[PDB]
UniProtKB/Swiss-Prot annotation, chains A, B:
<feature type="region of interest" description="Dimerization of protease">
    <location>
        <begin position="1"/>
        <end position="5"/>
    </location>
</feature>
<feature type="domain" description="Peptidase A2">
    <location>
        <begin position="20"/>
        <end position="89"/>
    </location>
</feature>
<comment type="subunit">
    <text>Homodimer, whose active site consists of two apposed aspartic acid residues.</text>
</comment>
<comment type="function">
    <text>Aspartyl protease that mediates proteolytic cleavages of Gag and Gag-Pol polyproteins during or shortly after the release of the virion from the plasma membrane. Cleavages take place as an ordered, step-wise cascade to yield mature proteins. This process is called maturation. Displays maximal activity during the budding process just prior to particle release from the cell. Also cleaves Nef and Vif, probably concomitantly with viral structural proteins on maturation of virus particles. Hydrolyzes host EIF4GI and PABP1 in order to shut off the capped cellular mRNA translation.</text>
</comment>
<feature type="region of interest" description="Dimerization of protease">
    <location>
        <begin position="49"/>
        <end position="55"/>
    </location>
</feature>
<feature type="region of interest" description="Dimerization of protease">
    <location>
        <begin position="88"/>
        <end position="99"/>
    </location>
</feature>
<feature type="active site" description="For protease activity; shared with dimeric partner">
    <location>
        <position position="25"/>
    </location>
</feature>
<protein>
    <recommendedName>
        <fullName>Protease</fullName>
    </recommendedName>
</protein>
């Protein structure tokens, strides 16, 4: 697909067995999801942006479907105001910026 | 150009006659640059990121050349961790996401 940027590039993702809406975010190194009680081992991490840092839980090798495209990788879980698909997964679904 | 996402989509911009490096950020509504001087009037504003809210200076109708493509639009100046080109200007230079 081609997604214009007149509005926020929100798309449907699937993780665990939850469908969520998430930003396709070229400015995010990592994928950061709103708080959810995922199974498995995790490690603590702090990630920074505008306003400062938040504490997150790093889960590895989590399968995620993004607009029907399969991905699997690291997902950070914490008190983000928006679900963010970062470059670690955008590359996996073949996403590019074009102009 | 087509820009893949295995690396941060950093580009050179020209603004106020100065060259800077900035991140093409589809997860950002607004363009936010690190502390700098710009001429003309500005308005105090607040924006919210992953870590909380910050104060910024809103400069309107500012010309900015991004990777050789011309935009003229709003630029926010404040304590962002990195210069970010948000959707208000990405749309001007005809940027889309594709996969
Ligand atoms: C600031 C950039 C460099 C990084 N951010 C991604 C942005 O796309 C972010 C994603 C994002 C979007 C919204 C809310 C939180 C985060 N956008 C914004 O902060 C700006 C603020 N804002 C905004 C919000 C409200 C009013 C005016 C505004 O301009 C807006 O529209 O975009 S991030 O969310 O902090 C981030 C994501 C993954 C990461 C990371 C940091 O480190 C490791 O892995």
């Amino acid at each position: 697909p081609q997604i214009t940027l007149w509005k926020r590039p929100l798309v449907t993702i699937r993780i665990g067995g939850q469908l969520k809406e998430a930003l396709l975010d070229t400015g995010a190194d990592d994928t950061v999801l709103e708080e959810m009680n995922l199974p498995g081992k995790w490690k603590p991490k702090m990630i920074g942006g505008i306003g400062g840092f938040i504490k997150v839980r790093q889960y590895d090798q989590i399968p995620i479907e993004i607009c029907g495209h399969k991905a699997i990788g690291t997902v950070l879980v914490g008190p983000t105001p928006v679900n963010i698909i970062g470059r670690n997964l955008l590359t996996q679904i073949g996403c590019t910026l074009n102009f």
